[PDB]
Amino acid sequence: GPGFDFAQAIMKKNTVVARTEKGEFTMLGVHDRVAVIPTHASVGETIYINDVETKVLDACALRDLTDTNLEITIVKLDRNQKFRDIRHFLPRYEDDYNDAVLSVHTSKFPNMYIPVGQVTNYGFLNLGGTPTHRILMYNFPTRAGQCGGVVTTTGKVIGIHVGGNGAQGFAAMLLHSYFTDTQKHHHH
Amino acid sequence: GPGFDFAQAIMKKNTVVARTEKGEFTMLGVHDRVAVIPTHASVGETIYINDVETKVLDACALRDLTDTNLEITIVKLDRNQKFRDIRHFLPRYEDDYNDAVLSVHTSKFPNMYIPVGQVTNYGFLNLGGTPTHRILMYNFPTRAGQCGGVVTTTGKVIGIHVGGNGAQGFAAMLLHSYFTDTQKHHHH
C-alpha cells in the first residue's frame, strides 16, 4: 500500500500552516528554520506561521539555469524552534515514483492524507501562464487549498503540491542539493 | 498509529458517491445492495450512485424507541453489483474508541483520509435543531463535504460522519444489529 505511517511522521514533526497575502498553505519545514512554500504564495517580509506573525529572514524563489520558474521558494524564518532535519529523506535526483501520498496541514484541514497513486517526472508545465520546469504529476483531481501539500513515498519526501487542472495534480520537485550548506554570493 | 490500511480497504471495496437533492455524500455499502447515508441527505425514490441514476427500492430513516432521530438511513438499491459483506466489521455495542480515521469518497475528494483521534460515545446531540441520539464525537474540525464519511478503527466500522461545529465532529453509530436478516412487519 501507500506509506501512510511515514507521511504522517512528516506531517506531525515537519509542517506548519503558513498564511501570506495569497492565503493559507501547507508548509514543509526542512532543517533549521528553513522551510519551503510554492512561489505563487507571494512571500513578503513577514508571514503567519500557525497564526503567529513571523519575520521572513530570507526568501529564495528557485529558478533553473534557463531562468525558468521551479515554483519552490525556500524561506528562512525567525522562530525559536528548529525543524527536525529531514534532508536525508530528500531524493538526490529526478525520478518517477509509485503510490505517493499527498498531505495537507491548513486551518481548514489540519491533518489530511490523499493517495494520488503514481508519480511521473513530468517536466514542463504552463502553470497559470507561468512556464515552469521540473514538475511531478499524478492522476488525481487535486483542488485549491492543497498547494504546499507534501508528496511522499515511504522514506522519501519528493515534492510539494503547486497545481492541478481538475484531473491531474502537479508538485514542484524537491532535491537534496537544494538545501546543502554552501558557498557565498549575492542572491538578491 | 491509525489503521490506515484498513480504512483504505473499506473505501476501496465498500464506498460510492451518492447525490440527492441535498448534495453529494460518501456512501458506505454494507452488504448486498444495502447501503447507509445520513438521514439529512433527504433520499427520495431515485439516487445518483457514481453519477448513475439508481432506483431506491427501500429507505429506512432509523429512529430509536424514544422516537428520536438516529441520523442513519438504510437504503436498498437497484444495482447489479453486490457490496462485499462487511457486517462482521460492525460493533455489536455502543463503545468509545482510540485513534479513528474518517474517510471521504465524493467527486471533490475521491479518496481522502483524516485521523480524528479519539472517539467518544457522546449520546444526545442537537443536530441543526433536530434532537438526535447515539452520536460519536471526535475533537477535529470536520467540514461540509464530509457527511457520510466512514469512521473506522482497525477491524471496525463504527459510524458515518453527520455533523460538526467547527471544533468537533459527530458520527451516527453503526451497530451490527441494524443489518440482521429479520422478521416481517409494515415499516412505512
Ligand SMILES: *[C@@H](CC(=O)OCC)[C@H](C[C@@H]1CCNC1=O)NC(=O)[C@H](Cc1ccccc1)NC(=O)[C@H](COC(C)(C)C)NC(=O)OCc1ccccc1
Ligand atoms: C493552490 C493555490 C491556491 O489554492 O490558489 C491561489 C492563491 C492551487 C491548487 C490547484 C488549483 C486547482 N487544482 C489544484 O490542484 N494551485 C493553483 O491555483 C495554481 C497557481 C498557484 C497559485 C498559488 C500558489 C501556487 C500555485 N494554478 C493552477 O494550478 C492552474 C489552475 O487553473 C485553472 C484554470 C484550472 C483554475 N492549473 C494550470 O494552469 O494547469 C494548466 C493545464 C495543464 C494541462 C491541461 C490543461 C491546463
Ligand SMILES: *[C@@H](CC(=O)OCC)[C@H](C[C@@H]1CCNC1=O)NC(=O)[C@H](Cc1ccccc1)NC(=O)[C@H](COC(C)(C)C)NC(=O)OCc1ccccc1
Ligand atoms: C454534512 C452535510 C452537508 O455538507 O450540508 C447539508 C446539505 C455536514 C458536515 C458538518 C457541517 C459543518 N461541520 C461538519 O462536520 N453536516 C451538517 O451540516 C449538519 C446537518 C446535516 C445536513 C445534511 C446531512 C447530514 C447532516 N449540521 C451540522 O453539522 C450543524 C452545523 O451547523 C453550523 C451552525 C455549525 C453551520 N452542527 C450542529 O448543529 O452542532 C450543534 C452544536 C453542538 C455543540 C456546540 C454548539 C453547537
